[PDB]
Amino acid sequence: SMSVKKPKRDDSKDLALCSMILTEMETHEDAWPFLLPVNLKLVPGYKKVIKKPMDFSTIREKLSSGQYPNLETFALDVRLVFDNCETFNEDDSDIGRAGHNMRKYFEKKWTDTFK
């Protein structure tokens, strides 16, 4: 509360570490569905159904331009990518499986880096 602060967690490396994680996600073999924004002209249903599209390139641009205020808002966008994928894709499809694998991969790196 006012003049009563929890001890300061060191956040000065967060930007660099999120960039590293994002690099590892970009270079995973199952990243291909997620590298670029879904083409809303060419994919029926996507525009209406997925209220907040997100992809790794868009996260990378936001990261690079100071549009994440903290490491939680970064994690929310990454998870959004996987939540959207589950909304639109059957679990038993190549893209559906890609999404589950990538989420698992992300969540481990996240825990190991920060928790």
Structural domain boundaries in the chain: 1-115
- Alpha-carbon distance 11 to 57, whole Å? 24
Which helix (DSSP H) or strand (DSSP E) does residue 49 occupy?
Answer: helix 46-49
- Alpha-carbon distance 18 to 75, whole Å? 9
Give the Å distances, CA to CA, from 9 to 45, 54, 86, 113: 43, 29, 34, 14
Structure-block tokens of residue 55: 């992809």
Angle 89-35-107 (CA atoms, 0-180°, nearest 5)? 70
Angle 24-64-36 (CA atoms, 0-180°, nearest 5)? 60
Name the phi and psi angles at 45, rounded to 5. 95, -25
Q: Which of 87, 77, 85 is nearest to 56 (CA)?
A: 77
Elucidation technique? X-ray
- Alpha-carbon distance 45 to 50, whole Å? 8
CATH classification code of 1-115: 1.20.920.10
Expressed in Å, this structure's resolution amounts to 1.8
